[PDB]
Design a protein around this ligand. Structure first.
Ligand SMILES: Nc1ncnc2c1ncn2[C@@H]1O[C@H](COP(=O)(O)OP(=O)(O)OP(=O)(O)O)[C@@H](O)[C@H]1O
Ligand SMILES: Nc1ncnc2c1ncn2[C@@H]1O[C@H](COP(=O)(O)OP(=O)(O)O)[C@@H](O)[C@H]1O
Ligand SMILES: [Mg+2]
Lengths: 471, 578, 41, 128, 40, 470, 193
């Protein structure tokens, strides 16, 4: 417990691995410290233990290590993090050490960073509607509290701006649902993996501008930092988030900047271990490893807190069938997919609603939550936009002059939709404003084309024109 | 027992030495915490154990003990209206013993040992009994749970308990040989329970969806597979089957999927109503849950537990429906364990015996004569999750070769929010011919002819779409435009169905027959009209088209009057023009 | 027609490349298994 | 029209099967009386010699307690140990030197091994 | 007609009796043959 | 007899046994565990130190302390007889109909010796299957290998059962011929489900076709090695009957896709590097050893004919299974999903089908002298009809010439009457009559590929000759 | 071995006007022909055998179907040699292989045929060698390479396919034999994609 034991006898160093032979007292998954001749100490974790030797992955570079002077000592049998309520407003690197110059925090508890699975009997239905201020999310892909809603992005697409805007504008609407009117702000846990200086500076400046740094915990792993440290950053961030949410009734919003770098590190370890690959060389357990991270969000019965996740990932070649987006979509509860075509045309935010999805949408909308026409309006918008895109395909072949009047109506609807509903810039729209714009757009089509909407709603809301809002 | 020590730990795999004499696929307790594992390889003096729980913190040298028995489930009263993990542990009692999280090494019984059941014996002393015979009856949530002799037990009854109340541990019936028969028994999950005889399927499995119940029917004892990419609508379809099917008992297996779905079922189903009994819907359901972040190796065990429970309920004389939320997760678990074994992969890294495992799992469905002389059935509907929506993937290709019906989902239909989003061109069913007499007796005398006419119309529309992609709709003649428009009407007003609507969620067979009849009558009238020079552009705005389109939302009991009114209007709308 | 034919040839090249990579991996792991069995037993 | 033909064929084939199973039952009940016969020691000597010639470098011989007295001489002559084993009946067992291989020369095993070979001759004798 | 089925059943049972009568004569011959052949 | 108890390894389907150098490569063995249950296995590798055995079924209860292995036979053999007709077997020759086991006349190795190429003679006589689109346009000749290409939901089992029920030889058309020539059917099903098994049993028993048939049925939950063995046993029986009792046998292999998948799994289980697209490199040789066991032999009166049936994995004729089958067989018969969805049975599409030996089995002295010309004319006319049917969707019927309208009507009538025959059994004469009735719809003189003599002899008959009972 | 290889100066007269005029082949050259069904390939090949000025004909069937091999083995014993009126078979050698024969034989068939042709050339004659369906030979080569666990190139073929094809095709030519006479070998190879 308090004595220090050192294992000399290292027989192999190559890449991110290191073999030590006479150590059978090392538990599987233990955390060790590696000391070389000059006295520098680096961390590592046991990933395989046997009677012959133990395999250790090094969290830093292996420069300067040798097989004659290096020694390995145990730190703890199980990887744990010291969490405290007083860590709001602090900054840490990828392995939880402070980087803001302030003293280390005094731990109230030490929690294992892998966490534990939530009992499905102990879970709860996510129901609270979250108003992000973005029409293509609030109306068509509603986000509820306790959901995992990743963002699928590209190389030049502005996913960071969208995440910052969502964190800045997100709010619940107690008055609509009739809940206990309380105005507690979100607590933001921010984990960065392989982030560059440009993106990190942007995020820090945005958080300073909104004054949210006093309610945020930052785990920063930059692009020049050691790669293998990324295996730990999401786990530490989610451990802190779960502790805050389910022991202090915070409503936590978790942002994970780029899971692509996480998958890169995972593949490095998998290739070093000769694991059987899945598709495109990624290890076969990547589904399980990603699920151990994504499944830590949600709400719990009998508790007031919640955890909401907004992972951000870049589809490598804008290819939705790449293993990373594929497995993420198979695990999470929807996605917001960005479009390069909309981006090139000057539209912000460039969210393409057709490939997007929100699985928990039906729980948080409807009568008594937002408005009784929400779901039908969303469905009608979807059908009309799909028809417009189809006619866009048609005119590329048969020319625009040969169209009927109905096809021209749908084409104009699609153009107006793209230029007014999606393209909002940096502004905060209430849900009523977005619904009003949606009805204004739907009023272009003949009243008899709205097959998805009941006649009461059509009588109540249809007719009012778009120029009355602008023009 | 055979006792050894841990020699090597790497993830969910433990190699134990000193284990000479152990047998394959036996349950072992690993470490001082007693984690449950299973032997999958014997090599000299060592054994390879896959642990059904997390193995972080274990150390080399800890004891390993073999129980000498394979994985088995307890079969008896107390399983209905319950949720279990991958190896049959009640999740409610885990939630009581542990907090909100699931921890290792929790030991609970599958059947509650404290509840008392009203026993009503049916055998008498001096009667010869055989495996599968009924010994007595116990009421359970409106059912009559029948106590069964274990499938391989023979003898003659010596004495029986008088009618009364007992726990499941009470030896109600004692044979001459002194073997005690309780209200329950255990059974290895990897062995199919014996039956007396298989039977041909001649009765439909009513799913409540028009497209599945009409175009691609599945019989009572059949098998169906529903693949598609993420977001297509597999889970919603399976839950609709759970809510609206006509099976007596539903067993729901969530192998390696989201926990929020299990929570949604657990919260909603108590508030819903059984379609036939009228009691709570949860009283006929059994949930086996193994979410994504639960231990990997239990994914394989969950499927076997579900199918074994379904077979037991079939043996009691019910018709059971079994839904598997994903079999690709089972395949991935196999692949991961195979990687641990360092075997030779086949195709996309899968072990070579994947197809054999799938065939063995799917071949347990069917309508049988039970060993007790009764009649029961098990219907299997399994979802598949190909990577990237690629249907050439080995799991999907293996599934094609053994299932009776194939329901392929389309991503393009799901993007435009058209549900259930079944790819009509890629789907099929092999039970269509065998169910015709039942449809004739129970739906209508000409129902197969209407169904075949609808199929022909869809085929013609699919054929014309090839030209339409080239020259556009306006270039076609009038008859082809009529075919295209009737195809669109069928797509939008018959095949489409809202799973969340209060009335559209469930659709009876007679309602579908009526809608098909109306559509065919309208098409005949329109063809006759365009034959005699009536403009097609004027037909599209007839006042009866909106009524045909909105006939979906009529309530089930109002429908006959609406059908009469609409048929009269169909006659008038073209007779009035002449 | 030339565009679609070029796309088809491109996709065929991608698939064949992936198949070749998988063959290489299988060869390597079989070699490792054989070496372990024949050297350390 | 064809159901009757199937009935006739099935009846004939099942009658033949009954006849052969009766023959097999008779030979089974005939074989088990040999230990009573005075020729039994020669039979067990032949069986033990066959077993040991079928197992080169054999370690030991294992037999029934009541049949080993007829095999005392052969074990010493062949230079192997002989053991007692009540379960083995009307035959002899020889355990290999390594302890991994073993052989059996029970008459019932020979009968079930050669019944398929002799079935054709049985049918020829009965109905040919 | 079922008279044909009755006739076929009659001829089948007649054939069964005839083949049994054929066997009964050489049953012992066959038994002796196999008993001789199995022994070394 | 002799038992081996030195098991040193059990994993997956394999187990290693020590001091087993007396086991020949490829032998069959029995594996017995503590409980007394016995399993099957085959030796796949022999060494001075140990032998490797691939176990049939499953290794659930096995251990290293009580398991023993004993030899069954050095080479897998099957005992054959003429009493096998009317019997059902499990794919390794074990009866599954409850009848007593057969008494073999001889036992032969299931793997067949190749036929000597100088011993074969040319195929020259046809088989009447009762299906018009096969008899008239894709004729099946005695000694041919003619597969069927089908899809996922297409009813290939119904076609197989119908052909097995209706196929016969027609000596009376071959000069005087001989009134008596035996005909038998050997049916092999690989990896079928319970539903298909029940359907096949019912179809073979309800019509009396079982009395001349031998069935080898292998279920989808059965061991894969039995699936590998089944076609070889079926072909062993076929060869024995044909070339030692002068039978005319027809062999039907129900699904070669299942056989290919089983072969792939077996290969991967032995750690063999796969060839193209994951299949074994030697797949072509294996398929050839199966297919090339048919033919007609000089000096013998018997014959063997094969109709392999296989489902194209994704309707892709580029797939290795159909591609390799095409190289070895003479033509193909391909089903159509469009015809099936239109309600036409049997859904055989004439255009992609082909029979490479048709020219030798038809003519004068066999079938009728107008056969080849009639088939050619039907092919050309149907192609024209489908083309015009496509064009009319754009330009309308009024814009077409009279010949185009006539071709369109001919194509419709052809699909409705020639192909959509249902469960009807049509003789070659009936099929030719229907063909001539359809051709009479076209005007005389447009029949370019038919000689004037045949036109004068047959043209002009009305469709009501068959429409009275289509 | 040979003393020296000569230039393609003289023609290989096949007797067919299109081939002898528009697309001539020299004596000692190489030609290829595809094998579409129903195009009368076999008739043209047997016409090459009958009418060309080759003294000896060597026919190699490497992986043909059973019935096609039966057809070719039945037809030749009936053809008559125009130059003498006696059977054409008196000046031909037939190498026959079906699909189910061992792979090694199918792979070595063309080498056996070309060696026999080289022998008859070294005797001073003019030999015509006809290889039918070298695609089947390539398939056999691919199978052998698979059994040896070699990394494939292109559509699974071994990377040395072109080298083997060149080694087979380059043995043709008009030479001065070691005895000082003149001989030639002409190769016609059928390729069936
Ligand atoms: N040079 C030719 N002279 C005369 N008739 C020819 C000639 N070439 C082809 N034919 C005719 O055309 C037919 C070609 O079709 P057939 O299938 O019989 O050809 P084949 O020579 O066997 O070749 P393949 O196997 O490539 O089809 C011949 O049967 C014959 O009737
Ligand atoms: N038949 C349907 N009717 C209405 N909505 C549907 C239907 N099917 C799917 N959806 C919507 O689409 C989303 C897709 O997810 P899900 O249905 O579970 O499919 P998958 O299992 O493939 O994800 C669901 O949240 C659901 O609300
Ligand atoms: Mg799902």
């Amino acid at each position: 417990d308090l004595l220090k034991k050192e294992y000399t006898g290292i027989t192999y160093i190559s890449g991110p691995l290191l073999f030590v032979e006479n150590a059978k007292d090392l538990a599987y998954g233990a955390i060790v410290d590696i000391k070389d001749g000059t006295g520098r100490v680096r961390g590592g974790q046991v990933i395989e233990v046997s009677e012959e030797y133990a395999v250790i992955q090094v969290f830093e570079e292996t420069t300067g290590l040798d097989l004659a002077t290096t020694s390995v000592s145990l730190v703890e049998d199980v990887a744990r993090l010291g969490v405290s309520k007083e860590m709001l407003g602090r900054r840490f690197n990828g392995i939880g050490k402070p980087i803001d110059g302030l003293p280390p925090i005094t731990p109230e508890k030490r929690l294992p960073i892998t966490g534990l699975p939530l009992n499905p009997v102990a879970r709860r239905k996510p129901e609270q509607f979250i108003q992000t201020g973005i029409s293509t999310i609030d109306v068509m892909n509603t986000l509820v509290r306790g959901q995992k809603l990743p963002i699928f992005s590209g190389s030049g697409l502005p996913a960071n701006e969208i995440a910052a805007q969502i964190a800045r504008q997100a709010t619940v609407r107690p008055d609509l649902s009739g809940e206990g009117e309380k105005e507690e702000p979100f607590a933001v846990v921010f984990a960065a993996m392989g982030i560059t200086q440009r993106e990190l500076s942007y995020f820090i400046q945005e958080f300073e501008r909104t004054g949210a740094l006093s309610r945020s915990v930052l785990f920063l792993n930059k692009a020049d930092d050691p790669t293998i440290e990324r295996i730990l950053t999401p786990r530490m961030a989610l451990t802190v988030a779960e502790y805050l949410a389910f022991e202090h009734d915070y409503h936590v919003l978790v942002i994970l900047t780029d899971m692509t770098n996480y998958c890169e590190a995972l593949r490095e370890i998998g290739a070093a271990r000769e694991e059987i690959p899945g598709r495109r060389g990624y290890p076969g357990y990547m589904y399980t490893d990603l699920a151990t991270i994504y499944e830590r969000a949600g709400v719990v019965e009998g508790k007031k807190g919640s955890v909401t996740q907004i992972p951000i990932l870049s589809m490598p070649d804008d290819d939705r069938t790449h293993p990373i987006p594929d497995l993420t979509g198979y695990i999470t509860e929807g996605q917001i997919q960005l479009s390069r075509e909309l981006h090139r045309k000057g539209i912000y935010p460039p969210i393409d609603p057709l490939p997007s999805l929100s699985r928990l949408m039906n729980n948080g909308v409807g009568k008594g939550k937002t408005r009784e026409d929400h779901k039908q309006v969303s469905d009608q918008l979807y059908s009309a936009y799909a028809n417009g895109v189809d006619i866009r395909k048609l005119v590329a072949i048969i020319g625009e002059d040969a169209l009927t009047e109905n096809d021209r109506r749908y084409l104009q609807f699609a153009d107006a939709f793209e230029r007014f509903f999606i393209n909002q810039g940096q502004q905060n729209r209430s849900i009523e404003e977005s619904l009003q714009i949606a009805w204004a757009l739907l009023s272009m089509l003949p009243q008899g084309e709205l097959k998805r909407i009941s006649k009461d709603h059509i009588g109540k809301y249809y007719g009012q024109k778009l120029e009355e809002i602008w023009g | 027992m055979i006792q050894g020590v841990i020699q090597k730990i790497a993830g969910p795999a433990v190699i134990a030495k000193g284990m000479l004499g152990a047998r394959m696929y036996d349950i072992c307790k690993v470490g001082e915490e007693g984690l449950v594992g299973e032997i999958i390889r014997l090599d000299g003096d060592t054994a390879f154990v896959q642990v059904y729980e997390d193995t972080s913190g274990l150390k080399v040298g800890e004891p390993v003990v073999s129980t000498g028995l394979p994985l088995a489930v307890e079969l008896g009263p107390g399983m209905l209206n319950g949720i279990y993990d991958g190896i049959q542990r009640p999740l409610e009692r885990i939630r009581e013993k542990t907090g909100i999280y699931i921890t290792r090494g929790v030991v609970v019984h599958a059947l509650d040992r404290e509840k008392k059941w009203a026993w009503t014996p049916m055998v008498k002393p001096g009667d010869e009994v055989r495996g599968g015979m009924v010994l007595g009856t116990v009421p359970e949530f409106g059912f009559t749970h029948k106590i069964l002799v274990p499938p391989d037990v023979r003898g003659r009854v010596k004495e029986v308990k008088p009618a009364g109340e007992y726990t499941v541990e009470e030896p109600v019936v004692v044979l001459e040989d002194g073997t005690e028969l309780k209200m329950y028994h255990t059974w290895p999950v990897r062995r199919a329970r014996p039956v007396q005889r298989k039977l041909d399927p001649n009765t439909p499995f009513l799913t409540g969806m028009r497209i599945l119940d009409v175009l691609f029917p599945v019989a009572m004892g059949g098998t169906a597979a529903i693949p598609g990419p993420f977001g297509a609508g597999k889970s919603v379809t399976q839950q609709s089957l759970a809510k609206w099917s006509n099976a007596d008992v539903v067993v729901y297996v969530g192998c390696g999927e989201r926990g929020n779905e299990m929570t949604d079922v657990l919260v909603e189903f108590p508030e819903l109503t059984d379609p036939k009994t009228g009691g709570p819907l949860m009283h006929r359901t059994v949930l086996i849950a193994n979410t994504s972040n639960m231990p990997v190796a239990a994914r394989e065990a969950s499927i076997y537990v579900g199918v074994t429970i379904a077979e037991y309920f079939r043996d009691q004389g019910f018709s059971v429906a079994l839904m598997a939320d994903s079999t690709s997760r089972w395949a991935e678990a196999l692949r991961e364990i195979s990687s641990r074994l360092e075997e030779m992969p086949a195709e996309e890294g899968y072990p070579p015996y994947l197809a054999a495992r799938l065939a063995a799992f799917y071949e347990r469905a069917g309508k049988v004569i039970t060993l007790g002389g009764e009649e029961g059935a098990v219907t299997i509907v399994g979802a598949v999750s190909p990577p990237g929506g690629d249907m050439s993937e080995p799991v999907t290709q293996s599934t094609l070769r053994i299932v009776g019906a194939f329901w392929r989902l389309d991503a393009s239909l799901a993007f435009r929010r058209h549900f259930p989003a079944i790819n009509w061109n890629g789907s099929y069913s092999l039970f269509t011919s065998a169910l015709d007499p039942w449809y004739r007796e129970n739906v209508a005398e000409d129902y197969p002819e209407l169904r075949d006419a609808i199929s022909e119309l869809l085929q013609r529309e699919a054929g014309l779409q090839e030209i339409v992609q080239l020259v556009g709709p306006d270039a076609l003649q009038d008859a082809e435009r009529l075919v295209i428009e009737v195809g669109r009407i069928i797509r939008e007003d018959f095949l489409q169905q809202n799973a969340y609507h209060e009335v559209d969620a469930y659709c009876s067979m007679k309602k579908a027959y009526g809608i098909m009849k109306m559509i065919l009558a309208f098409y005949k009238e329109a063809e006759a009209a365009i034959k005699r020079g009536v403009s097609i552009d004027e037909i599209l705005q007839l006042p009866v088209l909106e009524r045909i389109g909105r006939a979906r939302y009529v309530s089930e009991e109002e429908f006959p009057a609406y059908f009469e009114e609409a048929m009269k209007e169909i006659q008038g709308a073209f007779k009035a023009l002449a | 027609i030339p565009g679609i034919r070029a796309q088809i040839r491109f996709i065929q090249q991608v698939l064949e490349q992936r198949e070749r990579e998988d063959t290489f991996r299988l060869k390597r792991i079989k070699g490792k298994i054989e070496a372990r069995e024949a050297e350390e037993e | 029209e064809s159901a009757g033909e199937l009935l006739v064929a099935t009846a004939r084939t099942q009658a033949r099967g009954e006849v052969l199973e009766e023959v097999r039952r008779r030979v089974r009940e005939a074989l088990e009386a040999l230990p009573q016969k005075p020729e039994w020691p020669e039979v067990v000597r032949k069986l033990a010699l066959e077993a040991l010639e079928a197992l080169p470098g054999a370690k030991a011989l294992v037999a029934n307690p009541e049949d080993l007295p007829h095999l005392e001489a052969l074990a010493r002559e062949r230079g192997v140990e002989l053991q007692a084993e009540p379960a083995l009946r009307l035959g002899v067992r020889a355990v290999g030197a390594e302890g991994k291989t073993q052989v059996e020369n029970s008459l019932l095993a020979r009968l079930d091994r050669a019944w398929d070979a002799l079935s054709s001759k049985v049918a020829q004798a009965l109905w040919g | 007609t079922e008279a044909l089925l009755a006739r076929y059943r009659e001829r089948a049972e007649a054939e069964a009796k005839a083949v049994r009568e054929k066997a009964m004569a050489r049953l012992d011959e066959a038994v002796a043959l196999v008993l001789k052949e199995v022994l070394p």
